Design a protein around this ligand. Structure first.
Ligand SMILES: [Zn+2]
Ligand SMILES: [Zn+2]
Ligand SMILES: [Zn+2]
Length: 178
């Protein structure tokens, strides 16, 4: 097994996957690493199994059909993995915790949003369709772009949004286009 957390790239108290060489801090894994379960398989392994069981699940999909899917166990899992892929980027620190807004010339968003809030919402099964989760994720970056205006810090929202969108297209096998 790796000697650093796959998500935050630090050492510490690490739980090791039984079916691959990744390791995780308890609350870096999504869902939080399960109490018992020997053997234990990480989210990466669980996602790969879904693909292996149904190879056709990788054929292209329309985003509009994906968003309307109900949050059954497989879709729940895929949103957890997509959330985890965003936390994997170090720039996710800017979007993880509850923000506050006091900048000359800007007003804060009407509906603030942050990663840890999306994490809790997933854990609490508050999303009934994929659309709920994706809307909150895209709202994080949209709020950031609007608040920071022409400050160059706006670019952090572009960058982390791009990580989200690339992983959304991969995980949900969105049809490739020009
Ligand atoms: Zn970690
Ligand atoms: Zn694994
Ligand atoms: Zn199949």
């Amino acid at each position: 097994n790796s000697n650093i957390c796959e998500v935050c790239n630090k050492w510490g108290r690490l739980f090791c996957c039984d079916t691959c060489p990744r390791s995780f801090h308890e609350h870096c894994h999504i869902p939080s690493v399960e109490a018992n379960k020997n053997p234990w398989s990480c989210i990466f392994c669980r996602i790969k199994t879904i693909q292996e069981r149904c190879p056709e699940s990788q054929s292209g999909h329309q985003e509009s059909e994906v968003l309307m899917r109900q949050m059954l166990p497989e879709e729940q899992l895929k949103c957890e993995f997509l959330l985890l892929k965003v936390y994997c980027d170090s720039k996710s620190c800017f979007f993880a915790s509850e923000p506050y807004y006091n900048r000359e010339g800007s007003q804060g968003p009407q509906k603030p949003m942050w990663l840890n809030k999306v994490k809790t919402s997933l854990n609490e099964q508050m999303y009934t369709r994929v659309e709920g989760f994706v809307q909150d994720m895209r709202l994080i970056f949209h709020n950031h772009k609007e608040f920071y205006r022409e400050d160059k810090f706006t670019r952090l929202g572009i960058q982390v949004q791009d990580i989200f969108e690339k992983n959304f297209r991969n995980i949900f096998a969105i049809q490739e286009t020009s």
